Amino acid sequence: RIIGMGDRAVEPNIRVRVPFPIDKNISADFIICDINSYEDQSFESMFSETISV
Amino acid sequence: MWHYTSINNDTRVALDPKPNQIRTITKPNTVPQLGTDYLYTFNSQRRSHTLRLLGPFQYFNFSETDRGHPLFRLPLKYPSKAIPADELIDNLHSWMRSVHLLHVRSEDNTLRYNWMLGVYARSTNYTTPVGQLVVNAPAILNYSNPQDAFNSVFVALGIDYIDIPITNSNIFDDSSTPYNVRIWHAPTMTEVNHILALMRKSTLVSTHSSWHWNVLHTFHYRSESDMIDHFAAKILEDWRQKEKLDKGALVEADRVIQRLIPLSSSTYVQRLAAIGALYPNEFTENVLDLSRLSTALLQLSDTYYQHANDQLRRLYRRMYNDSRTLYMTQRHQELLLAQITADPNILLYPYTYIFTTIPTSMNYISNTGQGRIKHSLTVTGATEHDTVADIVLGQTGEDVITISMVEPMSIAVEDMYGYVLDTPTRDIWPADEQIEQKGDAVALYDTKTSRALGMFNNTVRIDDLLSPLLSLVYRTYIKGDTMTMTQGSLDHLTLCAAVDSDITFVGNRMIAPLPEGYIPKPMHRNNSTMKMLSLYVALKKLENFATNSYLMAPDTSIILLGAEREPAVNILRRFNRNVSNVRIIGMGDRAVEPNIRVRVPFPIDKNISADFIICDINSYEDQSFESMFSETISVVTTCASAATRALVKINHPSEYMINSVIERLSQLGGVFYHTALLKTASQNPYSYETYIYITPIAAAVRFPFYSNSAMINRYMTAVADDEMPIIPSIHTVIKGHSNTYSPGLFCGCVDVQSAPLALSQLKSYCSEATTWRVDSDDNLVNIIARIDPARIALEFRTRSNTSAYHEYQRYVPNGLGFKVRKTREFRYMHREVTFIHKLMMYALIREQISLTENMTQVVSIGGRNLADISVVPLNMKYVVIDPATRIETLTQEKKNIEVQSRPFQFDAANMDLENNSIYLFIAVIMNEPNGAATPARMQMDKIRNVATAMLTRTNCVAYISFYEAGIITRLDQSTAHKTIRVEEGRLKVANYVPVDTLVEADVTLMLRDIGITHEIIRPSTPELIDACSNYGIRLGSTGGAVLDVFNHYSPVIKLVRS
Amino acid sequence: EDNTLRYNWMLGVYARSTNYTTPVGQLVVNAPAILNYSNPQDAFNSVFVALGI
Amino acid sequence: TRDIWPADEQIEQKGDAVALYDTKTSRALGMFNNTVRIDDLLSPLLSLVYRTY
Amino acid sequence: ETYIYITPIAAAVRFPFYSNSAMINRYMTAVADDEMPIIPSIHTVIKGHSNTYSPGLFCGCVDVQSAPLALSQLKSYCSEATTWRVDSDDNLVNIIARIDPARIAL
């Protein structure tokens, strides 16, 4: 099973947010995260986004 | 201050061959043989013949004399490929052979040959004064410096300008040109100012900022309607050149600005020029760019006129009225300042204007590539809704959206054949309970099983599930195959259903040969053959666990008692064809040769005899119990003595029937018999059709009888007529935050303008959704949504609607997905057995909670905000106690939800439960907080310590679920093990880590001296029906055999004590 | 532009196939927008009132 | 390599991140960043073993 | 663009944090705006023993009669060079040379 998710996705990729509100029960053996973008925001707000990922 | 950089260098000027090499690159190209230089692709559009010559034969116009004669005509008028690849190479060679230009070989190494003007004269046969000049003196076309190339052909003639038609790249598109160009005589800077002021008030002309050759030249268009096709073509390029510059890179496109500048023009390109000269915020693109573009940009220009917003409109209107000057943006202007000082004496567009206000973007995000986007909606957001519209949709069509149901599924190959064996447990049949069980069978029989149960029984069948796929490996069989290997599970499969005829094996592995011209018919399978082929296998599995047999030793006899006339015999005969001498006999009370028509058992004589008997007797409605019983019981006792290892079939597994079957065997036969019933796959789920396998003991049987009856119990749960069939349906209508909708799903289409209006409301009923646009410029968006009671119970808690309008509105227009062709949607979805088991877990507790006098709070321990359904009423507070979960937003919106971020414990050290708290203990009393595995002696304390406290706490029910031991061996002898695998010592359900079993005999006994009240309630059929009906979920067929066993051995113990 | 319209297939192809010769097939030449309807039944009510048949 | 994060250097490292972020990395560094990419390096060859296939 | 791989220890980690930060340091060397983008270019011109040329490369063609005249001067700016005639009887020789600061300083 190879699943794909993101905040701009298209079937069979599923369009969601990160982390996303409660429920939905994400689960896997491996996760590869490539989150980032797309310009821009001040440091005090950017930090809270990077650290939350 | 970024001031990006670039390299500006003429790209046309540096194409012209040398004056002494111009000889080489023209005629002497007969030595080489083309091949890769020119570009050719062919489409069966049809038709397309894009044959395009590249440098140095690009921008080359063709004379009408040597155009048609040599080549072009005939190759085109095949027309339909055809068109051998040899034709192009050999024929194009023939053309390029006979061609040359007039020139003079020079000695100076710093000369260049004018290509453009040279080929212009040649192609016109030197007819005009411009082309005749280069006949008497062909050395005029040699120059050492650009610009000075043309200065020599205005002074020598006395003319002011030269007009020249353009070149079409495609050499098979023989049509009139869209426009032409005109080159003006202009030496100095002061001349350009004089000419461009003269270009005004004249038909239709244009320019473009800078120029190649350092000499003024302009464009002249044919008609007004064919100008916007050229403006919209250049504007598109400038948007790409500044895309790489604004980020910062290296480009080589000289000129700096590609945008065209309309001089004397109409009124359609003044509107178009304005919108293009402000670099709109098409990011991501949107716009509807692919097509038609020429009309999409006209709609775009209408946007900024009123939009969006302010000084953006003003900028637009400051360009609409003007459109006479070149508008630049500081940074982009600097490129000209950087290169105007690098080399003096170079012409630029006199009239420039600089502005620094973009200012900003929205911005947007979207995509325009094939795809069908799924959505996942939530119950919180940053917006506030109150009293909104009812966004109505209707009409699906049958072309775009097809609605069906069974559902069809997709599995493997060996998984088609598996079974689960049960085992008796009782050793005595009381004479006081022998008439108690009878009364249950008699009273039940009178009224047939629930009408609601039969809503799925004869509605869907195994045939409709497996056949669809089973007849696709038929197409695979044809022409194609690999190593097959006799005996294997693949072997008898492709021998059976795929091929009516026999199968020849050569090497025990190969499939050969091929069907030359005759196509062998697909074996016609039947409803009464699928049950027999999966039982034949089970029969061989019950004999010996050793795998890879399936074939018998020579001189073995098997007889079937059908179920005639039915095939099966032919299938189990062709399979045993190769193996020496095997006898497969078929009999029944409706049979046809080679099947023998008889009765059962049949009067004396005839001497029936075999090694194995498979009985499928029954039917066909109807007769009263006292007469039916005597028929069912007479079948068993006449197959038990007919063979040594037979298997029989009974209806109504009611615990009376099964016990009367054993009773009638233990008395007659010597040394008793050993009996055990079983289920197999492909038996039509929830059909209460069990099978009884009979073995001649091996000594003396310990526990012949049944006690609680686990597998049978399924049957003994049906009830008489009640309420209604339920039945899912469609709505095609949406209210805003309004309760009361029937289970099912709904779909339609809405205006893209109010697409995100619908999405903001769908969150109240469902979590999943699917959208797509049919075509890029239809503006209609199709929507499918599915109603789940798992979200309804979470939506309508209080009054807060919120939602997130802002989030979804960022899709319009494009970004909702694009999908062509047709698509089919189904009704009953597909879920495994890990999910359905839980749907029965919560369907049970819901009945128990919503019945008691009074409640204070419902408490769950472990989960993802799950088991929300079951909390009744919705007014009731809901508490979650788990170490890991998401908090805040969901708990802030007055949902009466609260979460404690602490690990619970079961030591009776700090217990505080109190009046009316309902605690759930799902799976959190098993393994560790991380995901390891715990002993079986450390899980008992999690009940002892909860009870110890509960003894003093006022009537406070605790709901606890735990695994029942005995599975150890019950799923070890079985053949179905795709899931619910047992790792010798531990149960492996789903994922996690395999967990230890709990000895039910000890767990029950140990609570008879500490605890007070402890009732064990197991989920039954009624919970299965309600689960499948509300959610709309089919049973997993091969997982259905898993459910009706796994379900039983997970007790839910209710500790309701005061 | 309205997303809640449906095109009458049966009547449309009937007229086309007869070269719009009959009064019923000529009606849909001057005004081909008559074949659009939002509600069944009302599809046909428009081609009896306009003809008088 | 480190085992302790000093509480006196936790705000010294912060000041470096905050002061640096404000101004994007060197313009000269970006002369090669978005100018050349892996795609332009490997794809040329990667699509020649396509013809081999 | 670095990546962070995370593993659930196996017992207790010794050195979880970073000190000098070697791989990260690369990032922490960028500065604000300064001078110029530099950018290589072409010259198509040769002076005899005269300093001050912009980095990059230059090329063209000369009369074969004065081919070795150019070669005697290219040695001042570069070490590598490439020449070829187009055709046997053109008498034009194409020259490509590349400027190296490893030779300028010598």
Ligand SMILES: Nc1ncnc2c1ncn2[C@@H]1O[C@H](CSCC[C@H](N)C(=O)O)[C@@H](O)[C@H]1O
């Ligand atoms: N939690 C989140 N919030 C916002 N955007 C997210 C996200 N998780 C992933 N993304 C997406 O990740 C992207 C970072 S750049 C990703 C590369 C880009 N998708 C490409 O195809 O080249 C953003 O476009 C963003 O939409």
Ligand SMILES: Nc1ncnc2c1ncn2[C@@H]1O[C@H](CSCC[C@H](N)C(=O)O)[C@@H](O)[C@H]1O
């Ligand atoms: N002793 C017996 N008396 C009556 N019918 C018997 C019988 N033994 C077998 N049968 C037959 O078994 C059938 C039960 S249903 C069998 C399935 C059916 N033949 C089919 O092809 O789908 C009855 O039709 C009955 O004719």
Ligand SMILES: Nc1ncnc2c1ncn2[C@@H]1O[C@H](CSCC[C@H](N)C(=O)O)[C@@H](O)[C@H]1O
């Ligand atoms: N002290 C405690 N008491 C009860 N549950 C606990 C606990 N500590 C942790 N848990 C929870 O028990 C769960 C074990 S795993 C349960 C299945 C998992 N929630 C799923 O959705 O698939 C974990 O989710 C964990 O959050």
